[PDB]
Amino acid sequence: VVWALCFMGSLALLALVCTNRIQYYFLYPHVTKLDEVAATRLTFPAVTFCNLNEFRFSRVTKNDLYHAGELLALLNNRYEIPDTQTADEKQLEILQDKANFRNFKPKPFNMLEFYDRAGHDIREMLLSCFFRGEQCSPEDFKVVFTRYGKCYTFNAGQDGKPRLITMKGGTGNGLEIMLDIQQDEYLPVWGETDETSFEAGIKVQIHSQDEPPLIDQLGFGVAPGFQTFVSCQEQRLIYLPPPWGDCKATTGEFYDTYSITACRIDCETRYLVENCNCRMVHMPGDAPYCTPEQYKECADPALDFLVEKDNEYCVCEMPCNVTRYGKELSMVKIPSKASAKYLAKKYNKSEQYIGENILVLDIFFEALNYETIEQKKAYEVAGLLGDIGGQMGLFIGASILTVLELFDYA
Amino acid sequence: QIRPAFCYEDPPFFQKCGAFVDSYYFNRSRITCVHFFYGQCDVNQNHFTTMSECNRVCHG
Amino acid sequence: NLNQFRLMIKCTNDRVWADFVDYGCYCVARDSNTPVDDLDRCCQAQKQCYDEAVKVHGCKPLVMFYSFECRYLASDLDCSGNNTKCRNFVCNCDRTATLCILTATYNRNNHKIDPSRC
Numbered sequence: 291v292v293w294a295l296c297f298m299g300s301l302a303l304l305a306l307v308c309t310n311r312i313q314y315y316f317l318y319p320h321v322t323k324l325d326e327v328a329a330t331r332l333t334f335p336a337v338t339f340c341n342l343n344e345f346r347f348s349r350v351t352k353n354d355l356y357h358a359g360e361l362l363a364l365l366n367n368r369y370e371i372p373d374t375q376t377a378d379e380k381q382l383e384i385l386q387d388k389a390n391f392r393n394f395k396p397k398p399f400n401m402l403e404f405y406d407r408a409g410h411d412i413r414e415m416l417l418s419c420f421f422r423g424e425q426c427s428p429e430d431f432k433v434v435f436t437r438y439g440k441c442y443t444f445n446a447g448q449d450g451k452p453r454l455i456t457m458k459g460g461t462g463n464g465l466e467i468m469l470d471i472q473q474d475e476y477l478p479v480w481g482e483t484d485e486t487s488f489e490a491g492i493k494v495q496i497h498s499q500d501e502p503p504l505i506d507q508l509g510f511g512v513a514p515g516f517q518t519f520v521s522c523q524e525q526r527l528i529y530l531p532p533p534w535g536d537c538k539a540t541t542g543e544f545y546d547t548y549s550i551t552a553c554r555i556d557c558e559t560r561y562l563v564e565n566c567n568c569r570m571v572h573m574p575g576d577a578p579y580c581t582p583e584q585y586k587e588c589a590d591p592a593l594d595f596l597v598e599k600d601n602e603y604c605v606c607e608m609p610c611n612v613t614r615y616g617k618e619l620s621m622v623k624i625p626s627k628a629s630a631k632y633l634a635k636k637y638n639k640s641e642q643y644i645g646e647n648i649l650v651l652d653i654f655f656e657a658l659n660y661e662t663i664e665q666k667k668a669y670e671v672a673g674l675l676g677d678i679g680g681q682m683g684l685f686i687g688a689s690i691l692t693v694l695e696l697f698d699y700a
Numbered sequence: 701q702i703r704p705a706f707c708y709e710d711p712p713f714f715q716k717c718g719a720f721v722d723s724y725y726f727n728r729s730r731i732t733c734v735h736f737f738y739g740q741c742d743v744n745q746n747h748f749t750t751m752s753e754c755n756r757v758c759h760g
Numbered sequence: 761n762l763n764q765f766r767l768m769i770k771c772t773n774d775r776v777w778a779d780f781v782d783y784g785c786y787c788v789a790r791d792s793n794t795p796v797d798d799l800d801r802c803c804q805a806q807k808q809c810y811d812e813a814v815k816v817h818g819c820k821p822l823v824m825f826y827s828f829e830c831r832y833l834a835s836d837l838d839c840s841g842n843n844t845k846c847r848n849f850v851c852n853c854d855r856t857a858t859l860c861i862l863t864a865t866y867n868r869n870n871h872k873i874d875p876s877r878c
């Protein structure tokens with residue numbers, strides 16, 4: 291009888307091991323698997339850029355200045371050129387005249403229309419553009435409005451345009467653009483607002499076509515007076531949805547592929563509508579566009595707060611698919627002394643102008659292979675069963691046969 | 701005191717102690733309840749199986 | 761602005777914002793001379809608060825944004841996170857008024873009434 295005690299004494303211990311394995315399975319654990327994937331091709335990403343200056347000086351009209359002057363620190367709250375004028379001679383004269391509102395009658399005004407008309411024009415900025423040996427043009431850039439205003443996306447892959455592709459590492463197989471940032475067109479800076487900057491240049495974001503830019507937060511800078519090389523590495527991150535993980539596949543609201551940025555732009559929009567009863571002109575939805583006074587009084591502070599300071603309003607669920615681009619930047623000078631005169635003549639500018647306004651930007655991949663990092667289910671059904679039946683043989687000597695035998699017996 | 705004090709606690713975002721499931725927590729910045737994925741780390745009680753429940757108990 | 765006020769109220773009160781929107785004389789942020797009761801007296805000191813905000817500090821309490829933290833205790837409702845006098849001041853006008861609302865009692869018959877009474 292000592293045996294039947296020992297047999298069910300080994301059976302008890304088997305039950306414990308088995309419930310452990312079952313409890314583990316119902317945690318739905320995951321592990322992370324790293325891999326390097328060699329490729330014959332890569333989809334070239336989308337490339338969004340913005341001039342750091344939001345409004346062309348030569349495009350600001352009396353009416354513009356009337357509605358938006360205070361926003362841009364060109365006017366005080368009395369609609370007057372402030373005596374804190376940190377301006378040269380000619381520009382003050384132009385602005386004084388433009389600010390003469392005596393017997394002026396205000397016409398309708400809209401910030402979106404104002405960005406669209408006054409913002410820098412890709413057709414003037416783009417001195418040249420090449421992708422993989424092929425010449426590209428302003429028609430290859432899609433307009434996208436952002437917090438910086440009127441911006442441009444290369445290779446947006448929208449409106450049925452196919453996504454461009456790279457097939458080798460290195461500079462020849464990417465994008466090269468020459469731009470004129472047009473500093474003579476920069477708005478005089480007479481104060482500090484969210485729409486003005488102390489800086490000259492562009493902001494750039496390299497991103498998947500399935501995600502909108504968030505260029506004020508996640509871009510990188512590029513300076514005039516240099517050729518900048520940006521050597522990229524693609525990394526693909528894959529997460530599991532529930533019950534294994536907490537990644538979110540799609541959103542059934544403003545954007546139809548889910549990404550952190552889509553999430554943040556949704557939140558920001560809901561937050562502005564909720565707190566200001568208006569949206570900024572780059573945000574999606576139906577709500578009215580904030581007036582310049584609303585930008586100044588409510589929308590700029592609310593968005594600044596939400597980004598910088600709020601800790602709970604927006605907390606975005608991780609997306610199941612994330613494409614990320616590691617980047618190595620470096621710079622050389624443009625123009626050389628030997629090329630300044632040539633560039634000056636070619637674009638009808640002085641050499642000083644070329645030196646202050648021209649930049650070249652090269653974006654390309656180091657190598658074609660991309661890295662993948664993936665959450666894998668760590669203990670599926672097949673693994674649970676084969677583990678249970680392996681513990682049988684360890685505790686009892688039980689088997690798939692030994693088990694079928696006890697149905698013949700019973 | 702209009703809503704319980706646990707309503708103001710952060711839910712355990714991204715923390716896994718088991719299976720992830722749809723849940724709802726009170727967001728003290730929106731002042732309303734919001735969907736999230738709960739992974740069984742019972743760190744506090746700011747998590748509900750349904751939106752209405754969360755809105756009933758914590759909305760006020 | 762009134763979106764923040766409305767949220768401050770929700771932070772501390774289950775009474776739907778509608779019931780305050782046109783109630784009495786002053787609710788919400790409307791002018792008059794004689795308040796109908798205690799609740800309407802809250803709005804009064806609130807309207808009185810905006811009017812000082814405007815005239816002394818140059819705030820635009822009906823347009824401007826401010827932030828606030830909703831806490832467990834209505835009393836603990838916090839305005840200290842604001843980074844300017846105006847945002848500080850107007851946040852406090854709204855904090856004062858939402859607390860006052862908690863003291864005062866609400867007569868549905870003083871809600872959306874005839875203009876003659878004020």
Ligand SMILES: N=C(N)NC(=O)c1nc(Cl)c(N)nc1N
Pocket residue numbers: 482598843
């Ligand atoms: N001219 C100013 N007053 N600027 C700021 O106040 C400010 N700027 C920046 Cl960039 C910031 N992150 N927070 C701020 N409060």
Ligand SMILES: N=C(N)NC(=O)c1nc(Cl)c(N)nc1N
Pocket residue numbers: 482483484594595598843844
């Ligand atoms: N990002 C921010 N937090 N900015 C400010 O706080 C701020 N900025 C500017 Cl530019 C300004 N004129 N006043 C401010 N209070």
Ligand SMILES: N=C(N)NC(=O)c1nc(Cl)c(N)nc1N
Pocket residue numbers: 672673675676677
């Ligand atoms: N711990 C493990 N690695 N188990 C298995 O690999 C496994 N075993 C068995 Cl017996 C099976 N049928 N399927 C499996 N996936």
Ligand SMILES: *[C@@H]1O[C@H](CO)[C@@H](O)[C@H](O)[C@H]1NC(C)=O
Pocket residue numbers: 500528547610611
């Ligand atoms: C999501 O990941 C899968 C697996 O790698 C991939 O096939 C798919 O293209 C990804 N989704 C997107 C939108 O890229």
Ligand SMILES: *[C@@H]1O[C@H](CO)[C@@H](O)[C@H](O)[C@H]1NC(C)=O
Pocket residue numbers: 638
């Ligand atoms: C170039 O020089 C200035 C630039 O505006 C202009 O006045 C002039 O007409 C231009 N000439 C040509 C040939 O483009």
Ligand SMILES: [Cl-]
Pocket residue numbers: 554557558596597604
């Ligand atoms: Cl955000």
Ligand code: NA
Pocket residue numbers: none
């Ligand atoms: Na284990």
Ligand code: NA
Pocket residue numbers: 483484485486487
């Ligand atoms: Na700024």
Ligand code: NA
Pocket residue numbers: 728729767827828829830
């Ligand atoms: Na708040």
